[model samples]
Target: MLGLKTSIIGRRVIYFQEITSTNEFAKTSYLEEGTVIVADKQTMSPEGGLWLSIVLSPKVPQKDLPKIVFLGAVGVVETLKEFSIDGRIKWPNDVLVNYKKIAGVLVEGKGDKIVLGIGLNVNNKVPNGATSMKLELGSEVPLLSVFRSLITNLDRLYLNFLKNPMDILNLVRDNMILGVRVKILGDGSFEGIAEDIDDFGRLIIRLDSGEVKKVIYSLRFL
Candidate 1:
């Protein structure tokens, strides 16, 4: 049943017991149009450790990366809802359940493919500062089930994008955890209250002094 939902998105499916990064592996494998790479664990090696799965879409273009990312973000949002957490998406790819990071998404462009990497705190018991579905739900949720749900939700969003790209923008706005104070990181750091994301996926924030800043993609929240 779980696999069937994922198959609705694409045909090829690849599973891995462990991988350095499923995104990297998928890119190197030159996966087919809808190939997905699932891994139990991901390693950062020199940076220590991380665990994630990489879902790839070969048909999506480089210019559409932001939109694809937004779809991935929505999927995380939907996935976290199952655990009864109001999983708010922190710009780009961090999923927060009651202000604590529960998952992260990283999308990378590899020529003909767009690798959507999802890192979630599943099965593993996190420390005091972090949380997971297993911790919050008080029982283990099958990883494969979670992945299938994510894929189904993502595929639905992707299809909507095909019908109307701007439609997803509205969906994003409606789901946004608004008015929250956040710090923008990378290249420099500044604080602002998140207003909303524009149609292009740019972060629109209002500064303390009543100035509005339109931040392009690539900026991270800290």
Candidate 2:
């Protein structure tokens, strides 16, 4: 099933019975641009139990990079929608359904390579403040089928980005989980109300002091 999906997408895939991290594996094979690495199981670093997929690509110009990450986030959102009560994207790359995190995405750019890593609480029976399809739907969902749906939506959004980058941004704004208070973390910590994301995907936050700041990096919607 996985093989057929990869063939349909025309992208090479590497499946591992177990791995430390799919992102790490994909990074090691830097030459394998446009490669999708799947891990049946993954571990944090010193410990080992997570489910992740890492999508890698060779570096393109800066203008083309954000779109790539955006498309990946969209793919996750679409997949989680199947079982999510109100599956929505938390700014940056976290997917929350009814206030619980169902999935996460990490987009990293190193030298001439770009890697998009996804960590989902899929078949896992236990998740921290999160719910999976199996837990919510009372049955295990097919991993390969979910992956195929992701790739399909990713391809469509990616192509749309190529035509007009701002279009995706607009879509993101319209579908944003709005009017939520958020806690901004990174460097230090602060709190604010999430207004909207700017054109560059920066979070527009209104601080307690009646000042709005464009927050960048590591934030949680409270």
Candidate 3:
């Protein structure tokens, strides 16, 4: 997956014909941090979708590890744009189009290493209310092309992150679906206007009382 643009994210790739889960294998296996785990078929998986995960070892603290999830989301959005599809991120780790989910990101931290899993609908059939690029365009999309675009975009952002931490957050804030009213569900539900994202990747909400609330994540979005 390298040599095209000297991408560090795809420098070392581990391919599997079939696997239970990429993230689970990445966590238990002994592999380099930058290695990518790709699967042609994932058992109990989203058939016809892009199923892959990246093994990451960030130099930052554990709390900062969650930021990688947003980075992945941004990469997917940017990649979608390359195919003439405008993708929007729904905070944390979901890529949406027209308020429908097009892709998802799952981040799991193990020790000093992190596994970032991405599931993107390409020429695949998705669940109700969810969409795929092929469905949107009415044709089959190239899988390898999409993977290359995604890896390249992520590699660029990851390099920028090493240089400037704010680079990823800024792009994420721009591509994110914000400025709408939302009610965060947790211990107690509260409504607010989704305003912006903080430095820590939290949702900055302007409450009804004009009180600013920073949310870690939402159970669901309005």
Candidate 4:
């Protein structure tokens, strides 16, 4: 039920009127390669967000799976640019506009299959510190437009990723929140300057004691 300008992504879309979560459903369910799962309403997700997931069975090695999230984040940022909105990656999984969250990415992988979940706040009645496309543009935007553009961008990046997975790392690092004071609450908790992103998508933080730590998860800007 769609016309997407992509050879892989969005060629097959499974749409739900309402679901618990697109990420949960997509990761558990069996779907063909490059299939996209979209939900009109996600009971478990934040309100007024574009909750969807893309299924991929990549030929690359397992270690390269993390690149899927980078691909998703970059795709989301590029899609926002299409509508004249400047979006940036907030490391790990979030997309921010003017330092306010506008979108998020969640990647789940098992074996050769990967589910890349993306949630974009479009027409959201978001609270403080959160923003949406409608909020940025001062007008309502059709969800279909965001979906179509995002899938197209993801498809293009996926094609490049299959050829050389390292390509995405540089783009992701360049687009992410870096060189700022940040806090890590989970394991490897510390307060440091977000120094750089490594080849494997790990954030390299320089601690107050002049120690460099490579952290892969649990990060928040200070």
**lDDT (C-alpha, whole model) for all candidates:** 0.69, 0.67, 0.85, 0.87
Alpha-carbon lDDT of model 3: 0.85
Cα lDDT tens digits for candidate 1, 73-191:
77788877865657877776677777677777788876756777777776676667767777777888777667767777777777676657677777667766777787777766778
Cα displacement (Å) at residue 110, model 2:
2.6
Give the TM-scores of the predictions, in the order they appear. 0.84, 0.84, 0.94, 0.95
lDDT for 11 in candidate 3 is 83
For model 3, the stretches where C-alpha displacement exceeds 4 angstroms are 1-4, 61-63
Q: Candidate 2: misplaced stretches above 4 Å? A: 1-10, 45-60, 82-85
Q: What tens digits encode model 3's per-residue C-alpha lDDT throughout 81-179? A: 999999999888899999899999999977778898999999777889999999877889988889889989888888777667767888999899888
Instruction: Give lDDT tens digits, candidate 4, residues 1-222.
Output: 466769888879998989998888888888888899998889885545688999998889878877788899999999999999998888878999999999889998765688999989998678788999999999999988888888899999999999999999988887888889999897557899988888888889899999998886767788
lDDT of 3 at 50: 90
Q: After superposition, how far is residue 46 of candidate 3 from its true place, in Å?
A: 2.9
The order of the candidates by lDDT, greatest first, is: 4, 3, 1, 2
**Better TM-score candidate (3, 4):** 4
| lDDT for each residue of candidate 2 in 1-222, tens digit (9 for 90 to 100) | 345433223277777787877877766665455567777777651112235444545234566576555666677777666544356777778777677777777877665666778776767755568776567667777776677767666666655665676777766676567688988776667888999888777789888899888865577767
Q: Model 2's lDDT to the true fold?
A: 0.67
In candidate 2, residue 128 scores what lDDT? 68
Backbone clash pairs for candidate 2 read: 43-48, 43-49
Decide which is better by lDDT, 3 or 4.
4
Of the two candidates 2 and 4, the one with more favorable lDDT, higher being better, is 4
Model 4: colliding residue pairs: none
